[PDB]
RNA sequence: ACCUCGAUGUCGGCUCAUCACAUCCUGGGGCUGAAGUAGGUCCCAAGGGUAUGGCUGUUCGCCAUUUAAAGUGGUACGCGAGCUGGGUUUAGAACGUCGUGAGACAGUUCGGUCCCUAUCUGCCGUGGGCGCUGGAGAACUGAGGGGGGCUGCUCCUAGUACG
RNA sequence: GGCGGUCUCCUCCUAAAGAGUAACGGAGGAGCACGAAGGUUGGCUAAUCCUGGUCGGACAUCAGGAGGUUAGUGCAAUGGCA
RNA sequence: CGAAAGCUAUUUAGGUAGCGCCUCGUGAAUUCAUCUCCGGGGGUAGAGCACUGUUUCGGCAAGGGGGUCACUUACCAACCCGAUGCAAACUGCGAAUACCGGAGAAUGUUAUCACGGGAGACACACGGCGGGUGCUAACGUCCGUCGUGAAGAGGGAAACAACCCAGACCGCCAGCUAAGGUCCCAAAGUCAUGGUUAAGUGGGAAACGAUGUGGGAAGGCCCAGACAGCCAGGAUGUUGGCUUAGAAGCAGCCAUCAUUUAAAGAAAGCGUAAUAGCUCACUGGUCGAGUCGGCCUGCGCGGAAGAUGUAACGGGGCUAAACCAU
Ligand SMILES: [Mg+2]
Ligand SMILES: [Mg+2]
Ligand SMILES: [Mg+2]
Ligand SMILES: [Mg+2]
Ligand SMILES: [Mg+2]
Ligand SMILES: [Mg+2]
Ligand SMILES: [Mg+2]
């Protein structure tokens with residue numbers, strides 16, 4: 184998954200989630216859009 | 222959607238069809254395709270054109286807002302999905318007939334045809350109709366009565 | 370230009386190390402333009418492991434040949450009261466060069482002495498004293514501490530999955 | 533430190549609205565000229581542009597009109613000067 | 615009692631000389647200072663754009679580039695006009711301070727001035743403010759000015775000349791305070807009331823990221839049923855036109871109408887060689903009361919890697935023993 188400092192939705196299906204202390208991005212269509220360190 | 226200034230037209234228009242109409246049918250279009258409408262518009266077509274409607278509205282809140290006017294036999298139709306059909310000219314006609322024949326070509330349910338208003342009542346497919354102009358069935362009742 | 374000019378030994382090697390992690394190998398993952406074999410990239414990981422030679426004073430670098438890999442850094446560019454003394458700066462000499470000349474050069478060239486019996490701290494070992502509440506001989510408990518932690522290849526699975 | 537540059541005088545800034553004020557801070561001049569370019573007396577008023585005008589043009593001289601010192605000052609800069 | 619590390623000049627720069635500042639003596643005027651009032655010059659801060667430069671857009675348009683041998687041109691462009699910025703060496707404006715002078719009261723151990731006897735000192739440092747230099751880098755460097763250290767101990771800032779509070783003649787096992795503090799190490803609130811944070815944030819850091827969370831002003835949609843789910847549909851001219859090997863809603867360009875309607879973009883995204891295929895917008899149904907997203911603000915989250923050993927509150931520890939207010 185991509186790590187980055189700025190994370191943001193990519194597809195219309197990307198979703199954004201705050202798990203543990205960390206901000207994330209989950210896409211149900213496109214694995215490339217997973218993101219952490221947000 | 223639109224505010225009231227528009228929820229009022231769908232009323233003042235649709236209720237002056239009841240106030241100035243002929244027959245009423247019934248139908249629930251769960252699976253209502255568009256080959257569906259296409260056809261029934263040619264049927265409205267034969268049945269004049271744009272003399273007919275079906276304006277899906279079964280929001281009690283709409284095509285009952287046209288009922289405590291006339292046809293308060295429809296507080297009972299309006300629940301769940303419905304497709305209200307009004308007649309202006311034409312016999313109390315065939316409108317009746319093909320809805321059963323249509324939906325009896327699968328063409329989705331017919332609300333079991335909960336029925337409507339000409340009298341003030343309920344269900345049962347009738348061709349007691351478009352014989353209308355079958356006053357010939359009272360012309361043949363002449364010579365055959367005169368002869369036989 | 371703040372410390373050291375009533376001295377704070379400088380490159381490189383050798384011996385011995387020790388930490389960090391921005392991880393070279395080994396381990397666990399996400400994504401892959403991931404079929405498989407195999408890569409790429411990001412995340413987590415510092416437990417252990419992490420090349421012999423040719424040339425040169427070298428570090429380095431190039432080259433040969435290995436290896437799972439031949440990691441990047443800090444430690445007075447770790448380590449001369451541990452070794453070396455090849456480089457660099459003693460007096461000798463010459464070349465080129467500059468200079469009238471004495472002489473001079475981050476130009477080169479051949480040659481030259483690195484001392485100290487360890488008081489203290491530290492550290493590796495090994496005893497003496499007293500304590501532990503009468504004295505004494507054994508056997509223990511285990512708070513705690515240290516050590517160790519690497520990996521190749523072949524065969525079977527199987528010429529199967531995949532192609 | 534050497535090599536370079538600098539070393540006296542004038543002008544602006546740095547200089548914080550009296551004076552003064554440093555740096556190998558930023559920019560420029562001087563080491564003269566003039567016996568008239570000094571004294572006094574009388575008189576005079578610029579640059580630039582528009583319009584018209586032979587040769588004449590973007591820019592010679594003439595005319596009017598704007599303008600009002602944006603010109604001039606023996607040489608730097610400053611402050612002055614009708 | 616009490617300096618200076620400055621000015622000036624110096625084969626001078628870590629020396630020296632005069633002046634400045636210290637001290638001792640003598641003599642002299644309401645002499646000197648603070649505040650108030652009156653009288654002054656100013657061109658700094660700031661602002662402004664007429665001037666001197668610089669600068670953008672608009673308008674007007676001298677002049678430059680191609681085409682002929684003076685005409686000509688889908689090239690660039692001063693002035694003046696209007697609008698908008700910029701200046702240490704710009705000023706048509708312009709302060710606060712500061713300084714000079716006059717008057718007046720209080721206070722001050724003559725604090726003033728002069729003359730004479732003795733000096734030291736002419737390496738300063740940091741801090742605040744205004745600046746040059748450097749990177750508005752340096753515990754850098756160079757002026758101005760105030761403070762302190764130097765030559766000043768004491769309390770605070772964990773430890774820390776230069777910061778904060780404060781000027782130690784001697785004694786006191788009295789008292790009140792300053793800064794700074796008051797759960798334990800450790801003197802004093804486990805004080806009162808109202809809020810915030812959940813991060814050990816407090817107790818290191820930016821652009822930027824994000825349904826963390828508190829507060830405020832306004833707005834949109836709602837029982838004629840909103841927001842989210844779930845059922846349905848999501849169509850015809852038609853592959854719009856163009857352009858492409860192929861552009862069929864969806865590579866590009868231009869258009870974006872018209873039907874049928876309950877509604878449905880000549881299409882918001884997936885997909886395709888292109889079609890095909892899956893969604894969305896939109897509407898009908900179900901459901902049954904709230905719901906959507908911008909503005910301003912408080913406190914927090916990521917962003918955040920280092921070398922002997924926790925080692926970025928002094929420690930313990932703290933959810934108040936943190937932050938805001940009274
Ligand atoms: Mg987890
Ligand atoms: Mg020094
Ligand atoms: Mg010494
Ligand atoms: Mg020594
Ligand atoms: Mg890591
Ligand atoms: Mg070394
Ligand atoms: Mg040698």
Ligand SMILES: [Mg+2]
Nearest residue numbers: 449452483484
């Ligand atoms: Mg030796």
Ligand SMILES: [Mg+2]
Nearest residue numbers: 527528529532
């Ligand atoms: Mg084979």
Ligand SMILES: [Mg+2]
Nearest residue numbers: 529530531532
């Ligand atoms: Mg096979």
Ligand SMILES: [Mg+2]
Nearest residue numbers: 547549550551
């Ligand atoms: Mg002045």
Ligand SMILES: [Mg+2]
Nearest residue numbers: 548549658712
């Ligand atoms: Mg001043």
Ligand SMILES: [Mg+2]
Nearest residue numbers: 585588589592
């Ligand atoms: Mg002329």
Ligand SMILES: [Mg+2]
Nearest residue numbers: 615616766781
């Ligand atoms: Mg005194």
Ligand SMILES: [Mg+2]
Nearest residue numbers: 619620736737
């Ligand atoms: Mg000095």
Ligand SMILES: [Mg+2]
Nearest residue numbers: 659660661701
């Ligand atoms: Mg200014």
Ligand SMILES: [Mg+2]
Nearest residue numbers: 639640641724
């Ligand atoms: Mg006296």
Ligand SMILES: [Mg+2]
Nearest residue numbers: 627629630736
């Ligand atoms: Mg001196």
Ligand SMILES: [Mg+2]
Nearest residue numbers: 739740753754
């Ligand atoms: Mg200094």
Ligand SMILES: [Mg+2]
Nearest residue numbers: 620738756757
């Ligand atoms: Mg000074």
Ligand SMILES: [Mg+2]
Nearest residue numbers: 763766767775
């Ligand atoms: Mg002190």
Ligand SMILES: [Mg+2]
Nearest residue numbers: 767781782783
């Ligand atoms: Mg005293």
Ligand SMILES: [Mg+2]
Nearest residue numbers: 789790791802
């Ligand atoms: Mg008290």
